Ligand binder design. Structure first.
Ligand SMILES: CC(C)(COP(=O)(O)OP(=O)(O)OC[C@H]1O[C@@H](n2cnc3c(N)ncnc32)[C@H](O)[C@@H]1OP(=O)(O)O)[C@@H](O)C(=O)NCCC(=O)NCCS
Length: 247
C-alpha cells in the first residue's frame, strides 16, 4: 500500500498520491488502487466526500511514461480506463487539492471533480500534442464547451501550460490559494461544508448537473481513447515519449 495513501477521516476519504521521487507519476497499480478506493467509498455510507491530492508540493506529472512505452494500454480496458470510469461515475462530492505540477491526466481529471483548489503557482498542462498524443478524459469535449474553441485550442493543440492563478480565472479551479499546505487545508474545509448538507440533495444535485452531458461524455471518452491507444503504438508518439526519458 506504498504509493496511494487512503486516510479515512470523519465522512471524508482522502486519496493521497505518494510517489514524490517520480513527481507522483501514475502507475498501473496507482490507478488500480484509486479506482477501487473510489468504487468502495461510493458504496460506503460512512463516506460523504473524497479528497484527491499529491500533498504540499506536487499533484501529479500524469501517466507514468515508462508504462506508456513498455505496455501501451487500451484506454477502455486498463487500469487508467478503470480509474477514469470510476471518477467520472463517482456519485458523491470529489475535491482536488493541487500543488506544483498537474500534467496530462493531472489536469484533465480536475474536469471531473466537483471542487478544485490549486496553489497560485501550480503548473498545469496537457502536453499530449507535444508527445505525439491527443486529448484524453473528455477534455476534447469539456474544454471547448467551457472556454470556447480558441482558448481550449491554446491548451490542447499547443499544449500551453498555465498557472493555478490562471486556472481559477478560467473557472477550471474554484480558487487559487497560497501554495502548499493552505491548499489542502482549504479543500478540507470545503469537504466539511458538504458534511453539513443533506447527503441526497447534494448527490442528486450532482447527478442532475451531469445528466444532460454524461452520455456524450461517455462516447467522447471512447472515441478519444481509441485515437489515443492507436497513437501510443505509433512511431510519432513512441519517439516523443522516449525522448522525454533521456531528456
Ligand atoms: C512534471 C515535470 C514538469 C517536473 O519536472 P522536474 O522538476 O524536472 O523533475 P523531473 O522531470 O526531473 O522528474 C524527476 C524524476 O521523475 C521522473 N518522472 C517525472 N515524471 C514522470 C512521468 N510522467 N513518467 C515517468 N517518469 C517521470 C523523471 O524521469 C525523473 O526520474 P529520475 O529522477 O529517476 O531520473 C516533468 O517531470 C515532466 O514533464 N514529466 C512528464 C509530464 C508528462 O509528459 N506526463 C504525461 C502526459 S501524457
Amino acid at each position: 500500500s506504498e504509493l496511494i495513501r487512503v486516510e479515512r477521516e470523519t465522512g471524508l476519504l482522502t486519496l493521497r498520491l505518494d510517489r514524490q521521487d517520480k513527481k507522483n507519476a501514475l502507475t498501473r497499480a496507482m490507478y488500480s488502487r484509486m479506482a477501487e478506493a473510489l468504487l468502495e467509498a461510493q458504496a460506503d455510507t460512512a463516506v460523504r466526500v473524497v479528497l484527491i491530492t499529491g500533498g504540499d508540493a506536487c499533484f501529479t506529472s500524469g501517466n507514468d511514461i515508462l508504462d506508456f512505452l513498455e505496455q501501451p494500454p487500451s484506454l477502455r480496458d486498463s487500469p487508467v480506463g478503470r480509474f477514469m470510469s470510476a471518477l467520472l461515475e463517482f456519485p458523491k462530492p470529489v475535491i482536488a487539492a493541487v500543488n506544483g505540477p498537474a500534467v496530462g491526466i493531472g489536469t484533465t481529471l480536475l474536469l471531473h471533480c466537483d471542487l478544485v483548489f490549486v496553489g497560485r503557482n501550480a503548473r498545469l498542462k496537457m502536453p499530449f500534442v507535444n508527445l505525439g498524443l491527443t486529448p484524453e478524459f473528455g477534455s476534447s469535449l469539456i474544454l471547448p464547451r467551457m472556454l470556447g474553441h480558441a482558448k481550449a485550442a491554446e491548451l490542447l493543440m499547443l499544449g500551453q501550460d498555465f498557472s493555478g492563478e490562471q486556472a481559477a480565472a478560467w473557472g477550471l479551479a474554484n480558487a487559487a490559494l497560497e501554495d502548499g499546505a493552505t491548499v489542502l487545508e482549504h479543500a478540507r474545509d470545503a469537504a466539511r461544508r458538504f458534511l453539513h448538507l443533506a447527503p441526497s440533495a447534494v448527490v442528486e444535485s450532482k447527478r442532475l448537473m451531469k445528466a444532460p452531458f454524461i452520455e456524450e461524455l461517455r462516447r467522447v471518452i471512447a472515441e478519444e481513447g481509441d485515437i489515443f491507444s492507436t497513437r501510443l503504438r505509433s512511431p510519432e508518439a513512441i519517439e516523443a515519449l522516449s525522448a522525454f526519458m533521456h531528456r
